[PDB]
A paper describes a structure:
To avoid the problems associated with this flexible loop, two of the six structures described below (those of R05-1 and EGCG) were determined using a truncated form of the protein in which residues 52–64 were replaced by a single glycine (Δ52–64:Gly). For R05-01, crystallisation was successful with the Δ52–64:Gly truncation mutant in the P6222 space-group. All diketo inhibitors co-ordinate the two metal ions in the same manner as described for DPBA and refinement is consistent with the presence of two bound manganese ions as confirmed by anomalous scattering. R05-1 has a similar configuration to R05-3D, with the two arms occupying pockets 2 and 3. Pocket 2 is characterised by stacking on the side-chain of Arg84 (e.g. benzene of R05-3A, R05-3D and R05-1). Pocket 3 is characterised by stacking on Tyr24 (chlorobenzene of R05-3D, R05-1, cyclohexane of R05-2, resorcinol moiety of ECGC, base of rUMP/dTMP). Most interactions of the compound arms are with residues in the range 24–38 (notably Tyr24, Glu26, Lys34, Ala37 and Ile38), which comprise a flexible loop leading from the C-terminal end of helix α2 into the N-terminal half of helix α3, but Arg84 and Phe105 are also involved in some cases. Due to the hydrophobic and aromatic nature of the arms, most interactions are van der Waals or stacking and there are no polar interactions. In general, for each of the diketo compounds, the ‘arms’ have higher B-factors than the metal binding, diketo moiety of the ligand, suggesting flexibility due to sub-optimal interactions of the arms.
Numbering used by the authors: 0 to 52, 74 to 139, 141 to 195
Write the structure that this text describes.
Amino acid sequence: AMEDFVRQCFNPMIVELAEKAMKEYGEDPKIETNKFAAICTHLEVCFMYSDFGHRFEIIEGRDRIMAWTVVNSICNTTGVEKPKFLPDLYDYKENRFIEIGVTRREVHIYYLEKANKIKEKTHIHIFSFTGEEMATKADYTLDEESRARIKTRLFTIRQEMASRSLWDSFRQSE
Ligand SMILES: O=C(O)/C(O)=C/C(=O)[C@]1(Cc2ccc(Cl)cc2)CCCN(S(=O)(=O)Cc2ccccc2)C1
Ligand SMILES: [Mn+2]
Ligand SMILES: [Mn+2]
């Protein structure tokens, strides 16, 4: 059962935030179990990305109002243009917002989908469960070790799902 997998694979904080995000956005984690797993995974990557730095402000994982309050605050103190859509992080070193993508498909495919969706100051960084990444301008932002740890965690999630015969379902759900 994917729902039970998610509850054993991710730390309690992450699972809580994923459940809250789903309800805030209408969804039931008991039904949309692949989505529930994807949201946890994406949350964890965002937190790991941010912990590898206080270089980053984490925007993902906050309730909508707080997320926009933070984004507004950053825009007001940097003059960086306000994004049309909530991004995932702000990079205080490069002074740009970052959109983090996690895909079960090819990274170039998901990159295009994201870049098309969001539109040009927001830096995009895409990770696969295959150790692939693609980023705006091939600027991967983090050092090699930080990206390697993210890649390892994603691949580990995939294999833990594969252990329980849940990977194939999860992969086709995107
Ligand atoms: O696709 C991403 O890489 C990504 O960063 C997605 C997001 O930020 C989502 C996350 C989300 C998805 C589904 C659900 Cl049910 C809830 C939240 C989905 C896109 C829209 N937004 S959102 O624009 O940030 C609005 C939001 C904020 C907080 C909680 C719920 C909703 C939240
Ligand atoms: Mn997001
Ligand atoms: Mn994202």
